[PDB]
Design a protein around this ligand. Structure first.
Ligand SMILES: [Zn+2]
Lengths: 70, 286, 278, 74, 94, 50, 85
């Protein structure tokens, strides 16, 4: 049942997404990130790897609706 | 023409829920309706459909009535909501067709150039992937019969679609998914031998039955022609692998080496990191 | 007067036309009609759902055609069961499926035509498989402001329906409206074959046909080697030494269990040689 | 040959659906001449065109439908 | 006819039933490659022809009897050991 | 997280900028690409705390 | 007189909503294709089963869907001063 929940979060958010630019990490599990239009939003980061893929500045794909960091 | 078809569980239930209609009110025959197909390519796809009142007498086994007033106006109702959706043929739950079905298909050929009938199954039993698909063509015959209309079997495969898995895949909830890599392939190995060797035993028993009675089918020739394709290697005792023996373990070469090599490193990751982390918390707690 | 908690009995044949007519109108919102029978006050059943024409200019109350229903009900007479109409529904694929300004306008129009006319909404985007999604709501009379606003009894399904509370604007629309619980009467006859028909066609297509193999092992042994040395530098980073770096950090997962299943795949895939043959 | 009137009613009701397509556009477009046929991958043939907007967006829709591509230059 | 393989076949056995000289066994087996009844590549070192695929023709009452002997034999030998694989390995499935 | 993602799901959680505070209980909020909007209570952040 | 039924059925296919166009940038994987709409937002979306390998292209204009933003058909890109020239 937990592995079934792991398959869930592995799919999510799947597709589609929108390209954005990461600005900085304000705290853990959430950070501010800009979109392609340059819209800085408050977004919960994905809980798998919070370190090596976060980066000081990087181009990140954000969800179509939630604009989530994955 | 039509090579393969795609039948969705949504249109299939549209045959099943109508079995609850004529099932409680009776009486004879089966569920028969007009099939709404979708053709984006040579492969055929079916999304929705509509069930029509239908009756077939026994005596009088050739008597059948479609309702064209229900076939006409409701098509315009569905044409208005869905433009690409159109009737590709008819269907029924069988399980076994009758010779009268030549008249049902030939009457509706004015609507569509080729009507594809779909035999479905309301209660799944045996032996495998359910329902069926038939296409209407004319192969004449080799014996000299007049031009003969016999429905040829069409391979049918189930398919999915977006937004239709919401309630469908939720209601089951009892299946374990998938799980690829452990039980998924090994279960089918017990099934591919079961389902593979029972239809084997079922067909070889029918091939022996052809000697006693039932000739024709002669067939001809598809029975032995396709059997000899299976006979490229029989395989018979023992396996005739003298050339494939040293190659056999040679296929197990990389498999065993990747096993032992990686498992030794996986052990080095499992044993080391565990003893470290365990000795840390254990002795520093008290 | 007396009001009791209402329960929605849905048929699996009705649930299909919901999302299928909703997928056809995607992205735009459609306007449908619910079909069923009223058993009593505390329970309601929807035994059928039929498709209605989409509105490309936007949803309006004129989208529902009365002569369209008179001929549809006439077609239900020759059909096995000619049940009477009950209520309406509309899809909302473009957003979180909340009742819009048009949805409330057709409420008082349909609640005069039919007794209940329970509003049902659905959206494809919220989930894929393991969520019911959809939506359900019913208009409570705004003239009741003089009377009490807090029915019904049987707080079980009321408290569970109030949660999760589904964001905000949905509860912001709780003014003049109240939700209603949805349960599934047993389809298990067809629901048993629904799991059977889906998995039988999803297992190797015959369960035979699938038995990328060794070429994926060269790709696997790349993920069993090249990914290993980069993951095994971190235990060297665990030794500082000692100790100037932030601890603890657990680098064990998840690749170790991936290498476990990787060899489980290749060993049981090598068994295909000895299974099919003898 | 009397099916004409019942068939003539649906062209006016579809035109009534064009009359609700008459009222009313918030969008005005610029036209681009295009000829596109995609072999698959039985066959789907036709013609499509490119459509601009006054909001700076550029859309994609098949050749109109109603007025054909005989007129005019974009 | 034979279950073979016994795939690669020597020239003397072909030159027996076909009663052809060794110099003409070249055009013999290689022309059938163009006809399409056999795709087999010939091994010309030992002059042993190696057959591939096969061409089925007609059928006989003894061919059905020869089939039932070599057909079900592949069924009964595999299903035997197939239950043996299901015997021990089923405990890890659960 | 899935429940937290829902709160961030529909339109997404944005980042506003307060140019000035008003005595009318409404707080001016500026989005970077868009203009300067305004919103009222907001009972979590007090008016004098803005 | 069936031409009226043929003409109206063709207008029923016109009930299909139009899509949007954009310019392909790059591709992360097979399930994610970077595409830049004429407005300038950039999305990574999946694709349907009716397309081919010629759809990808090295930075050529494509037609994105209005729902999942998937590509339907590709067309040659021009800003078209030249016909005026
Ligand atoms: Zn609406």
């Amino acid at each position: 049942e937990f592995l079934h929940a792991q398959e869930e979060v592995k799919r999510i958010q799947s597709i589609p997404l929108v390209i954005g630019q990461f600005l900085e990490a304000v705290d853990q599990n959430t950070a501010i990130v800009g979109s392609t239009t340059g819209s800085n939003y408050y977004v919960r980061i994905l809980s798998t790897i919070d370190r090596e893929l976060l980066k000081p500045n990087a181009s990140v794909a954000l969800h179509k609706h939630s604009n989530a960091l994955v | 023409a039509v090579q393969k078809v795609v039948v969705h569980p949504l249109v299939l239930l549209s045959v099943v829920d109508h079995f609850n209609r004529i099932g409680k009110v009776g009486n004879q025959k089966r569920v028969v309706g007009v099939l709404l197909g979708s053709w984006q390519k040579k492969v055929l796809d079916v999304s929705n459909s509509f069930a029509v009142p239908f009756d077939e007498d026994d005596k009088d086994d050739s008597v059948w009535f479609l309702d064209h007033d229900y076939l006409e106006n409701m098509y315009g109702m569905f044409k208005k909501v869905n433009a690409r959706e159109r009737i590709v043929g008819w269907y029924h739950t069988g399980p076994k067709l009758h010779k009268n079905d030549i008249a049902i298909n030939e009457l509706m050929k004015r609507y569509c150039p080729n009507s594809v009938l779909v035999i479905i199954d309301v209660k799944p039993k045996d032996l495998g992937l359910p329902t069926e698909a038939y296409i209407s063509v004319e192969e004449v015959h080799d014996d000299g019969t007049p031009t003969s209309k016999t429905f040829e079997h069409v391979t049918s495969e189930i398919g999915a679609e977006e937004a239709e898995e919401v309630g469908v895949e939720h209601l089951l909830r009892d299946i374990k998914d998938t799980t690829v890599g452990t039980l998924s392939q090994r279960i089918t190995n017990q099934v591919h031998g079961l389902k593979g060797l029972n239809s084997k035993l079922l067909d070889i028993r029918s091939y022996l039955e052809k000697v006693a009675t039932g000739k024709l089918p002669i067939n001809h020739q598809i029975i032995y022609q396709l059997q000899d394709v299976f006979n490229l290697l029989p395989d018979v005792s023992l396996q005739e692998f003298v050339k494939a023996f040293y190659l056999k373990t040679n296929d197990q070469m990389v498999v065993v080496y990747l096993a032992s090599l990686i498992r030794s490193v996986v052990a080095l990751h499992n044993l080391i990191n565990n003893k470290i982390a365990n000795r840390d918390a254990e002795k520093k707690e008290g | 007067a007396v009001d009791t908690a209402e329960q929605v009995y849905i048929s699996s044949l009705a649930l299909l036309k919901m999302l299928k007519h909703g997928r056809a109108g995607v992205p735009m919102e459609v306007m449908g009609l619910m079909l069923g029978e009223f058993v009593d006050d505390y329970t309601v059943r929807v035994i059928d759902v039929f498709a209605m024409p989409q509105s490309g200019t936007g949803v309006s109350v004129e989208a529902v055609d009365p002569v369209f229903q008179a001929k549809m009900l006439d077609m239900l007479k020759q059909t096995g069961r000619p049940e009477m109409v009950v209520g309406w529904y509309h899809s909302h694929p473009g957003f979180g499926c909340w009742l819009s300004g048009v949805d409330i306008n057709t409420q008082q129009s349909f609640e005069a035509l039919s007794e209940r006319a329970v509003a049902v909404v659905v959206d494809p985007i919220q989930s894929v498989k393991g969520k019911v999604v959809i939506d359900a709501f019913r208009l409570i009379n705004a003239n009741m402001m003089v009377l009490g606003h807090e029915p019904r009894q049987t707080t079980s399904n009321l408290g569970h329906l109030n949660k999760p509370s589904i964001q905000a604007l949905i509860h912001g629309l709780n003014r003049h409206y109240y939700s209603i619980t949805i349960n599934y009467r047993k389809n298990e006859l067809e629901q048993k074959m629904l799991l059977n028909l889906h998995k039988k066609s999803w297992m190797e297509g015959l369960t035979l046909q699938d038995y990328v193999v060794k070429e994926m092992l060269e790709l696997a042994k790349n993920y069993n080697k090249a990914v290993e040395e980069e993951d095994k530098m971190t235990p060297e980073q665990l030794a500082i030494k000692n100790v100037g770096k932030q601890d603890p950090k657990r680098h064990l997962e998840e690749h170790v269990d991936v290498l476990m299943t990787s060899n489980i795949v290749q060993c049981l895939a090598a068994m295909l040689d000895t299974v099919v043959f003898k | 040959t009397h099916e004409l009137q019942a068939m003539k009613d649906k062209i006016k009701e579809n035109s009534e659906k064009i009359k609700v397509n008459k009222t009313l556009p918030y969008l005005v477009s610029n036209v681009i001449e295009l000829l596109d046929v995609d072999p698959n991958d039985s066959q789907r043939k036709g013609k499509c065109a490119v459509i601009k907007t006054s909001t700076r967006q550029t859309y994609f829709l098949p050749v109109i439908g109603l007025v054909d591509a005989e007129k005019l230059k974009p | 006819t034979r279950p073979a393989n016994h795939r690669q076949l020597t020239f003397e056995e072909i030159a027996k039933s076909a009663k052809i000289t060794v110099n003409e066994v070249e055009l013999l087996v290689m022309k059938a490659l163009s006809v399409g009844l056999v795709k087999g590549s010939i091994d010309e070192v030992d002059k042993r022809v190696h057959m591939t695929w096969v061409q089925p023709r007609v059928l006989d009452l003894q061919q059905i009897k020869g089939m039932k002997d070599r057909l079900e034999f592949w069924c009964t030998d595999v299903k035997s050991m197939e239950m043996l694989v299901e015997h021990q390995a089923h405990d890890i499935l659960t | 997280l899935r429940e937290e993602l829902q709160l961030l799901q529909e339109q997404g959680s944005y980042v506003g900028e307060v140019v000035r505070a008003m005595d009318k209980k409404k707080v001016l909020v500026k989005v970077h690409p868009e203009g300067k909007f305004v919103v009222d209570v907001d009972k979590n952040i007090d008016i004098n705390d803005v | 007189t069936k031409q009226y039924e043929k003409s109206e059925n063709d207008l029923k296919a016109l009930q299909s909503v139009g899509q949007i166009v954009g310019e392909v940038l790059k591709q992360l994987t097979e399930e994610k294709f970077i595409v830049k709409a004429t407005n300038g937002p950039r999305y990574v979306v999946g694709c349907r089963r009716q397309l081919d390998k010629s759809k990808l292209k090295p930075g050529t204009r494509v037609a994105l869907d209005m729902t999942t933003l998937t590509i339907m058909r590709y067309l040659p890109r021009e800003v078209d001063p030249l016909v005026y020239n």
